[PDB]
């Protein structure tokens, strides 16, 4: 990988998932009050064919 390893992985273009690159506390918190105050639309989920 002579070109773009942490660059591509940085912007969440490819690699991990929202439930994987966060502190456990934040994930638990989102699970808690997802109903009346959403947050999920604030972080990309990369997808690769």
């Amino acid at each position: 990988t002579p070109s773009m390893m942490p660059q591509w992985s940085y912007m969440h273009i490819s690699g991990q998932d929202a439930s994987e690159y966060l502190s456990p506390g934040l994930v638990q918190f989102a699970r808690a009050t997802e109903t009346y105050f959403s947050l999920n639309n604030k972080f990309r989920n990369p997808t690769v064919a």
């Binding site: 912007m11 273009i13 990369p46 997808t47 690769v48 064919a49």
Partner: protein
């Protein structure tokens, strides 16, 4: 009884859309980032591109509108109160 000899014209209308062409081995949409974007042969070097269009004639000046479907992302970070920092990344055509 007294009809007359005729020929036929055919055409169609496709207003309110765009013409699309994906970039894959089989034109399908298997993911947000296609496979061929990750093929080395178009990824580890440089190449030149040529496009040729042929369209119906018109009477007055027109414009050809070309969109290169690409990636463009922004990331935002807030370390301390009262300071906000951002980084924009543009995919090919970032110059």
């Amino acid at each position: 009884k007294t009809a007359v000899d005729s020929i036929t014209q055919k055409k169609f209308l496709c207003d309110r859309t765009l013409w699309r062409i994906p970039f894959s081995s089989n034109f399908m949409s298997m993911g947000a980032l296609t496979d061929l974007g990750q093929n080395l042969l178009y990824a580890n070097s440089a190449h030149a591109l040529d496009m040729t269009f042929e369209v119906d004639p018109m009477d007055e000046p027109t414009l050809l509108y070309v969109l290169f479907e690409v990636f463009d992302v922004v990331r935002v970070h807030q370390p301390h109160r009262g300071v906000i920092e951002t980084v924009y990344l543009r995919t090919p055509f970032s110059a």
